[PDB]
Amino acid sequence: SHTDIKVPDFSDYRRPEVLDSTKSSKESSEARKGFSYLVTATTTVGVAY
């Protein structure tokens, strides 16, 4: 009965590199963090400026 749970569908919030089951996500792990971290780096670089 706690087995009637099921996590709801997040398809419309997901980054495209994921979104597909069959595919592992480790493969887009570096890119997705890459992009989000680059954003902060750039920010702090700008704020540094």
Binding site: S1, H2, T3, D4, I5, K6, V7, D9, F10, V18, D20, S21, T22, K23, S24, S25, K26, S29, K33
Partner: protein, 446 residues
């Protein structure tokens, strides 16, 4: 003085064979008067669809309630009367049926397994009787916080995949699953090349091979054209599932990162790391002096009632982390410390702790394979996973290869700056926010 090393070579080789069926027949002879035999099949909830999920679990119920040649309670009386024990279990990737029995009863033990595995009656009245038993086990299971929390952990970690599902299935499948759904799941899966007949004890390989040929020949006298028995990989998702229930006296929490899978050699180092961290329970003698910093800090500061590390392996994926139980005002401290230890190992592991972790694995490995049943289960499922047996000595060499570096690198790979899967049940208001948990997976000084 036989040395430990020497004794590892003294362990007799596991003998493997194959019928024309594709059925692998494997044994480890030992000269005990007793033995364990059974069949290992790779079938389990991960192979099921939304629609028939809980099918295998339903068969396991029916499995011992009557074949064609021994209907109703005839099985029971044959087993009970020889003094043997008949068990079964199902995980998400594996199913098993085995008999513990007097060694000279191997012939019937085997005769019995074939009958179970092949001629399962599935009498319509029985399935109905079982419908209510399973439902009942479900209510039963809902009260084990730990079982519920790992089920949640799988459900969020593998969120849109088959590995997300539990073994028993949802209540509605139990309600609607019909006989035809079962027979189709059986035909689809209980096929020779995915079954291993395993045994351990005072037997001899030829006898087991003969019996395998006598009672098992005739399973893949067919073998399918385009069927579709392939397993698709399962997406792991960095996510959190929080089942808040302030009516429960303690919180259950289970965190994990994505493991590599049964085949990956990285598993040896991961387990060594996991041994270092250990487990803990409030009935352990000596707390402040325990080697594991998590364990000792938890004991001194009462952060915990229990906790354990884990490495669940599935094909090409897995869950690697820890689960813990604690009071409502200690979840935050338990997480802080648990996470400090992963980080510490990732970047800072020392040599003597790795040695302790290594030895702990050696003792565990050997302590475990003690007696026919555990060895049988190991032969049976190893062939399912690795394809071979992997003798103690090979494990020993793998373990020996691990040193601090290996721990640091191997830990970094799976743990460092990685999105975890979080499952929580109970008085969990103080469970840290996901961003906060996520930030604990990397160190700003590193």
């Amino acid at each position: 003085t036989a040395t430990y090393a020497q004794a590892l070579q003294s362990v007799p080789e596991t003998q493997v064979s194959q019928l024309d069926n594709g059925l692998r027949v494997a044994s480890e002879q030992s000269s005990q008067p007793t033995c364990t035999v059974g069949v290992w099949i790779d079938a389990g909830s991960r192979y099921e669809s939304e629609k028939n999920n809980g099918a295998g679990y339903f068969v396991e119920h029916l499995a011992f309630k009557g074949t064609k040649n021994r209907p109703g309670n005839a099985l029971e009386k044959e087993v009970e009367s020889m003094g043997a024990h008949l068990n079964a279990y199902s995980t998400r990737e594996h199913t098993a049926y085995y008999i513990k029995a007097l060694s000279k009863d191997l012939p019937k033990a085997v005769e019995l397994l074939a009958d179970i595995v092949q001629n399962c009656s599935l009498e319509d009245s029985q399935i109905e009787k079982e419908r209510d038993v399973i439902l009942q086990e479900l209510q039963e299971n809902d009260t084990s916080m730990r079982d519920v929390v790992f089920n949640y952990l799988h459900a969020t970690a593998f969120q849109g995949t088959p590995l997300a599902q539990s073994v028993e299935g949802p209540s509605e499948n139990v309600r609607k699953l019909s006989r035809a759904d079962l027979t189709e799941y059986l035909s689809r899966h209980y096929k020779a090349p995915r079954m291993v007949l395993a045994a351990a004890g005072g037997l001899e390989h030829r006898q087991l091979l003969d019996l395998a040929q006598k009672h098992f020949s005739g399973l893949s006298g067919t073998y399918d054209e385009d069927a579709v028995p392939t397993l698709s990989p399962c997406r792991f998702t960095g996510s959190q599932i929080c089942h808040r229930e302030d009516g429960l006296p303690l919180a259950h929490v289970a965190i994990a990162v994505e493991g590599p899978g049964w085949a990956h050699p990285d598993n040896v180092a991961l387990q060594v790391a996991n041994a270092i961290i250990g487990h803990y329970d409030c009935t352990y003698g000596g707390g402040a002096h325990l080697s594991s910093p998590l364990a000792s800090i938890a004991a001194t500061n009462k952060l915990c009632q229990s906790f354990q590390t884990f490495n669940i392996c599935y094909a090409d994926t897995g869950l690697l982390g820890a689960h813990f139980v604690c009071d409502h005002m200690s979840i935050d401290d338990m997480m802080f410390v648990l996470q400090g230890q992963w980080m510490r190992l990732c970047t800072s592991a020392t040599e003597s702790e790795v040695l302790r972790g290594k030895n702990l694995l050696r003792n565990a490995l050997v302590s475990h394979l003690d007696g026919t049943t555990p060895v049988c289960e190991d032969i049976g499922r190893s062939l399912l996973t690795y394809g071979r047996r992997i003798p103690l000595a090979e494990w020993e060499s793998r373990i020996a290869e691990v040193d601090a570096r290996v721990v640091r690198e191997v830990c970094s790979k799976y743990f460092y700056d990685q999105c975890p899967a979080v499952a929580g049940f109970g008085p969990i208001e103080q469970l840290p926010d996901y961003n906060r948990i996520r930030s604990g997976m990397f160190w700003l000084r590193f």
